[PDB]
């Protein structure tokens, strides 16, 4: 596309460090555009992301680096009967009435445990000491991974993140950095060594862990789903499900710190925490551009005639700064009117874990603000955000008077 020749000079490093300047141009120039270093069409606006995500002429496809990492059948990358089965497999523990039965007793004692380690220190780096551990410890216990330390769960999602988002391609469309999948393969090998004995056990002795239910639910007597059939969805969980509530919490906190009067409002009135989190997810979407769809028929989207079989990456984090919807979207504003957003995606492949995720983030922030009501950001340290596929702050140094 001639007038987008500037896109040939966009680099993977640029998109990882800060994709918003390129995507502001895309939303104005070409809401559906082929980005050479990603080797794919990308959807950048709210209208195009929502249309592709809900279109009957599209179905799910995994991004190239996502498929190299997760294989088949990753719940995000399949359709039809396999997708319906995998959705029926994951949905029981995520049902709102079910989450409401036990989410408080799950997350609140975990939040308190991690807080007790630093709440009298006067300083902390909340990404590593709080947001990530609460997120992974909550989900890890729900899954049946109680014995996998939070440090290890955090390491695995970081390696899987880098492998799944190792998207750069060269002039021939080949991956530019094939070595960057090695740590994804190493994480998977480690996960197998830990999880294979647990699956061996659960097949014979089912329990209330979610993965035990994935093996047994809905199956004929004495049968379980084959572990190779469920492992790619285990990996989907050990990346995003483990990573994103912590990133959403942390981005919400960075946003609140950027508006001190609003941080104060929320600490004084914790019933505003859900609204603060919803704006946090719009402001820096944790899953920023990690999923995609593929056309099943020739289709015209945003004036582009796509043949059948065309992948489109859904850059929901850009869509959530669409100035057709939002005033000054790069500013965090608690008091934005509560409008639809796309941080959980849309359509038949929209996030299955919204209700659980929102509660994890809510409870963690409630406990944080109760424990440390005079929490302040350490303005001697900068907050750097990183990531194009998954995005969040790489640290969050704070201070408080002791
Ligand atoms: C703040 C935290 C989270 C955010 C922002 C988030 C966001 C997303 C997004 C954008 C997608 C892709 C939707 C699309 O392609 O249209 C997705 C997929 C998915 N998410 Fe969430 N997620 C979060 C936490 C979780 C958690 C904790 C779980 C599990 C307990 C979960 C389970 C899933 C599943 C199973 C899918 C795949 C749905 C499918 O392809 O059918 N997510 N999520
Ligand atoms: C819930 O986890 C994910 C969602 C979308 C893409 C990758 C994931 O691991």
Author numbering: 6 to 407
Reported in the publication:
GcoA belongs to the CYP255A family of cytochrome P450 enzymes. Our recent characterization of a two-component P450 enzyme system consisting of a reductase, GcoB, and a P450 oxidase, GcoA, demonstrated that it demethylates diverse aromatic compounds, including guaiacol (which can be derived from coniferyl alcohol and represents the aromatic functionality of G-lignin that must undergo demethylation), guaethol, anisole (methoxybenzene), 2-methylanisole, and 3-methoxycatechol (3MC) with similar or greater efficiency than other O-aryl-demethylases described in the literature. However, GcoAB shows poor reactivity toward syringol, which can be derived from sinapyl alcohol via high-temperature reactions and represents the aromatic functionality of S-lignin that must undergo O-demethylation for further catabolism via ring-opening dioxygenases. In the present study, we hypothesized that substitution of GcoA-F169, which has the closest interaction with the bound substrate, may relax the specificity of the enzyme sufficiently to permit the O-demethylation of S-lignin type substrates.
The closest contact is with GcoA-F169, which forms a hydrophobic interaction with the C6 carbon on the aromatic ring of guaiacol. A broader survey of variants at the GcoA-F169 position (amino acids S, H, V, I, and L in addition to A) confirmed that GcoA-F169A exhibits the best catalytic performance in terms of both specific activity and reaction coupling, although other small side chains (S and V) also permitted reactivity with syringol, suggesting that these may permit syringol to assume a reactive conformation at the heme. Each protein variant also crystallized successfully with guaiacol and the structures showed that the orientation of the bound ligand remained consistent with that of the WT enzyme. Furthermore, comparison of the surrounding active site architecture confirmed no significant deviation from the WT.
